[PDB]
Design an enzyme around this catalytic site. Structure first.
Site, PDB file in Angstrom:
ATOM      1  CG  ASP A  83      -2.215   0.853   1.006  1.00  0.00           C
ATOM      2  OD1 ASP A  83      -2.388   1.464  -0.078  1.00  0.00           O
ATOM      3  OD2 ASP A  83      -3.038   0.948   1.958  1.00  0.00           O
ATOM      4  CE  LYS A  84      -0.346   7.163  -2.670  1.00  0.00           C
ATOM      5  NZ  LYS A  84      -1.219   8.366  -2.457  1.00  0.00           N
ATOM      6  CG  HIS A  85      -0.895   7.289   4.421  1.00  0.00           C
ATOM      7  ND1 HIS A  85      -2.261   7.413   4.272  1.00  0.00           N
ATOM      8  CD2 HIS A  85      -0.520   8.260   5.283  1.00  0.00           C
ATOM      9  CE1 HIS A  85      -2.690   8.401   5.033  1.00  0.00           C
ATOM     10  NE2 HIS A  85      -1.655   8.925   5.661  1.00  0.00           N
ATOM     11  CB  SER A  86      -0.379  10.896   0.203  1.00  0.00           C
ATOM     12  OG  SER A  86      -0.035  12.277   0.080  1.00  0.00           O
ATOM     13  CB  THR A 123      -8.192   8.970  -1.989  1.00  0.00           C
ATOM     14  OG1 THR A 123      -6.902   9.541  -2.228  1.00  0.00           O
ATOM     15  CG2 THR A 123      -8.441   7.825  -2.981  1.00  0.00           C
ATOM     16  NE  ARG A 171      -2.303  13.480  17.527  1.00  0.00           N
ATOM     17  CZ  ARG A 171      -2.144  12.996  16.288  1.00  0.00           C
ATOM     18  NH1 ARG A 171      -2.786  11.910  15.888  1.00  0.00           N
ATOM     19  NH2 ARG A 171      -1.343  13.615  15.434  1.00  0.00           N
ATOM     20  CB  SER A 186      -2.313   8.920  14.080  1.00  0.00           C
ATOM     21  OG  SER A 186      -3.666   9.044  13.709  1.00  0.00           O
ATOM     22  CE  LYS A 190      -6.356   7.162  10.821  1.00  0.00           C
ATOM     23  NZ  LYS A 190      -5.124   7.591  11.526  1.00  0.00           N
ATOM     24  CE  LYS A 191      -2.423   3.105   4.173  1.00  0.00           C
ATOM     25  NZ  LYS A 191      -3.679   3.224   3.384  1.00  0.00           N
TER      26      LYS A 191
HETATM   27  C1  LIG Z   1      -6.740  12.358   9.621  1.00  0.00           C
HETATM   28  C2  LIG Z   1      -5.529  12.335  10.513  1.00  0.00           C
HETATM   29  C3  LIG Z   1      -4.571  13.333  10.456  1.00  0.00           C
HETATM   30  N1  LIG Z   1      -3.493  13.297  11.276  1.00  0.00           N
HETATM   31  C4  LIG Z   1      -2.504  14.363  11.168  1.00  0.00           C
HETATM   32  C5  LIG Z   1      -1.692  14.191   9.891  1.00  0.00           C
HETATM   33  C6  LIG Z   1      -1.447  15.616   9.438  1.00  0.00           C
HETATM   34  N2  LIG Z   1      -0.040  15.880   9.665  1.00  0.00           N
HETATM   35  N3  LIG Z   1       0.834  15.533   8.840  1.00  0.00           N
HETATM   36  N4  LIG Z   1       1.742  15.175   7.992  1.00  0.00           N
HETATM   37  C7  LIG Z   1      -2.242  16.504  10.395  1.00  0.00           C
HETATM   38  C8  LIG Z   1      -2.989  17.655   9.737  1.00  0.00           C
HETATM   39  O1  LIG Z   1      -3.671  18.439  10.730  1.00  0.00           O
HETATM   40  O2  LIG Z   1      -3.149  15.628  11.055  1.00  0.00           O
HETATM   41  C9  LIG Z   1      -3.296  12.253  12.210  1.00  0.00           C
HETATM   42  O3  LIG Z   1      -2.291  12.226  12.986  1.00  0.00           O
HETATM   43  N5  LIG Z   1      -4.210  11.277  12.279  1.00  0.00           N
HETATM   44  C10 LIG Z   1      -5.307  11.261  11.506  1.00  0.00           C
HETATM   45  O4  LIG Z   1      -6.120  10.325  11.615  1.00  0.00           O
END
Ligand SMILES: Cc1cn([C@H]2C[C@H](N=[N+]=[N-])[C@@H](CO)O2)c(=O)[nH]c1=O
Ligand SMILES: Cc1cn([C@H]2C[C@H](N=[N+]=[N-])[C@@H](CO)O2)c(=O)[nH]c1=O
Lengths: 440, 440
Positions: A83-86, A123, A171, A186, A190-191
């Site tokens: 997978d990829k995460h951006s 996405t 947060r 975080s 998930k990934k």
């Molecule tokens: C949607 C989501 C964003 N974020 C963070 C990722 C983003 N930072 N970077 N790179 C940040 C944007 O406010 O929130 C997170 O830690 N957990 C989450 O589930």
């Protein structure tokens, strides 16, 4: 006892938390025995004191294990789970091509993605421009699609890393989002719940990136790579550019159109191509589908050239309950805007910089994103024909073409686009699209 | 906007908050628009970064002004409005004598006090050993009693500094109690809501004190004095000893008995006398009822010697719906324990140290205090005849006399008392009861 306040105190006073303590706290978030105040307090102690590699790993694993974790072994697939995460951006539509491309080269991509956040597109919101497209298949159906098609792109269910849900929600109202260990945990909670063999991270740099400096982008990338590999998932990261729109479009339907046209070879934004290809190459190499860059690129180019990647995208859309002839007939299905009209700069010159955060917020303000979760998106609005840094603009080249839901809407968007872009009498110095690769 | 998260962020990053920002945040706590997570996050930023004198004053004033603030001017009283607050201890019964003593010398003392906390007794719990005694008179009735008697001792109503209620409740589960600015603001939000001219603070030092070192006791005292005087209330503080029980008793009914016997001259623990007198002297001087220590002491001694202070105490008890003949007939009214029996040390020697926190917790465990707010107190249990540091103990001198609710209870208390006290073959070095006075 009980421990929750003692755990906060310990971290507050600069001591490393044990795996046991972290697991207890995360489990307490999961079962609602630890309060929002206690989550926020711990979050703030982590902001101040950071976390060591062992803490970061414990925190990530605990959050991952707070909910359902997918396992693929029982399907007896003959390819890697990858997978990829951006970190997100504007025109960051890579996943819509990358998933099908990697699937066409033998990968299996169970992509749990996200909605728009702040100034960034999402996405899942882009895919929901496709009529019928279902981001929430049931567990068994998701498995069928991965087996048969090779890729699916879905939303985060209530069973996914539920401790992260409450942690992030806290947060995001307590100024504790901006912490490398918390972000890393975080993202990976998930990934890693996808049961991956391999992962690539796209950490954005520049005015449209969430991390505000190159150095901080780099540190986040390093953190994610270290933690993910520590968890047994072969992971690399690319630092890539978000100092302008990546695709030639920004929005929902407009970006899906761009994805389709990329896949069919009608049009390929070269910067979007570069990032998409580079991320796919990482996935093939980490997933052991190719031995080096050159071989990876050859395989990925082949599936573009022979129509296979486009076919996988079509099959994915059909399998997720979009139209069966979507690639062929997307124009019939993707909603068009009420008013589509070019915005021209007030003067002639070279596009020198573009506040890509501001461009992102302009799309939100048009109705193409949300300010609060209950907001309804207009799937037609956004930008196409984006000018790029270094483009000469004049009466023959607009800054963008704006797709707007009415004329008042168009005027406000045109104003925001012009305000976000500075022209100069010389082209700016060019910049790489991919700055660096980070490996274990 | 809104500002709450921005305010947390600002403090998080080490900037001083403005009076406006502090007032906004406190008001948001008051009207329940700022969440527990946001309170905890701000609390933790203050723990890490502290607060300047202007911040501390703003925070205190904001919390004070979040609820009802008493005003006395309209009663046209001919004396100062003056009070005492203690950080708490074991046998810390000073208020029951000090209020009547100062009232008998022309002061008006609207004492909003508290219940037991952790290992410490609470004046309100001690008073509730008196049958009928009402700690919650209505607003108008409280004013009548202050006018007619000169002193009343009451509980904290829902209208008193309500923002402090939520702030403290959050602090106490998030490891953000232990912060000098937060403690100072919490204490003074309540005391300054009494509409005082003058205040004395008793900050305890030693094993039964909340602050764990002399230096930290001293810093708290300095903070409170600075903030209170900044608010227009003439304030001083004494650092006083809590390395043993202050009174000769610890509990509820037993401490009320001690108070009465002190006032009538039957018995006066000399250390309790020293602290009580020193605190009263501060109140007379700050309240301008005496020009110097010697004159203050002469006036206070006179009201002990002539029975006036005892009479004021009796009138206070009657006015707050206790018995009208309480001073005379307290033995009839104060509940006696099932079993009263001396505990003797296992060996002969000098009492060398006494873990006064442990002694406090022993009373809680006997049922004379609470572990959670819903707990019911047995008003009869506790200790009398406490041995003091430097006392030779043997078959003729016990460590204490234990008043217990049954025999099993007595055995556990006796065990705890013996465990809390170390004997030595020589008396320990003596220590002052009053270490230092802190003024503006
Ligand atoms: C949607 C989501 C964003 N974020 C963070 C990722 C983003 N930072 N970077 N790179 C940040 C944007 O406010 O929130 C997170 O830690 N957990 C989450 O589930
Ligand atoms: C009851 C109460 C205690 N505290 C603090 C005072 C005590 N510290 N000292 N000295 C501390 C004991 O846990 O709680 C507070 O700040 N506000 C309150 O309302």
């Amino acid at each position: 006892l009980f421990l929750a306040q003692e755990i906060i105190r310990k971290k507050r006073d600069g001591h490393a938390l044990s795996d046991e303590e972290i697991r207890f706290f995360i489990n307490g978030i999961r079962d609602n025995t630890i309060s929002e105040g206690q989550i926020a307090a711990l979050a703030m102690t982590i902001f101040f004191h950071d976390m060591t590699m062992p803490e970061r790993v414990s925190l990530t694993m605990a959050m991952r294990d707070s909910g359902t974790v997918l396992d693929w072994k029982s399907l007896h697939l003959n390819g890697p789970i990858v997978d990829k995460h951006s970190t997100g951006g504007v025109g960051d539509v890579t996943s819509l091509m990358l998933g099908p491309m990697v699937a066409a080269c033998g990968g299996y991509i169970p992509m749990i993605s996200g909605r728009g956040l702040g100034h960034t597109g999402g996405t899942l919101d882009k895919l929901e421009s496709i009529p019928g497209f279902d981001i929430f298949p049931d567990d068994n159906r998701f498995r069928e699609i991965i087996k048969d098609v090779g890729v699916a792109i879905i939303g985060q269910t209530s069973s996914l890393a539920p401790a992260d849900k409450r942690f992030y929600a806290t947060r995001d109202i307590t100024a504790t989002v901006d912490s490398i260990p918390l972000i890393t945990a975080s993202i990976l909670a998930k990934k890693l719940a996808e049961g991956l063999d391999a992962l690539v991270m796209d950490v954005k740099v520049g005015s449209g990136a969430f991390m505000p400096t190159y150095e901080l982008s780099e540190a986040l990338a390093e953190a994610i790579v270290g933690v993910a590999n520590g968890a047994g998932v072969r992971t690399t990261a690319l630092l890539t550019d978000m100092n302008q729109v990546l695709a030639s479009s920004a929005g929902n339907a407009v970006e899906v159109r761009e994805a389709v046209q990329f896949l069919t070879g009608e049009y390929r934004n070269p910067r979007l191509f570069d990032v998409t290809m580079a991320l796919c190459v990482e996935m093939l190499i980490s997933g052991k589908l190719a031995k080096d860059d050159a071989e990876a690129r050859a395989k990925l180019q082949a599936v573009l050239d022979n129509g296979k990647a486009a076919e996988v995208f079509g099959r994915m859309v059909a399998a997720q309950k979009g139209p069966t002839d979507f690639v062929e007939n997307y124009a019939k299905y993707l909603p068009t805007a009420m008013l589509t009209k070019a915005v021209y700069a007030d003067t002639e010159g070279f596009v020198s910089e573009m506040d890509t955060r501001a461009l992102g917020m302009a799309v939100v303000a048009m109705g193409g994103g949300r300010r609060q979760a209950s907001d309804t998106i207009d799937y037609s609005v956004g930008f196409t024909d984006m000018a790029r840094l270094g483009d000469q603009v004049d009466g023959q080249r607009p800054l963008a073409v704006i797709h707007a839901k009415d004329e008042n809407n168009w005027q406000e968007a045109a104003k925001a686009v012009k305000a976000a872009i500075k022209l100069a009498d010389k082209a700016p110095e060019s910049t790489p699209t991919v700055y660096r690769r980070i490996s274990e």
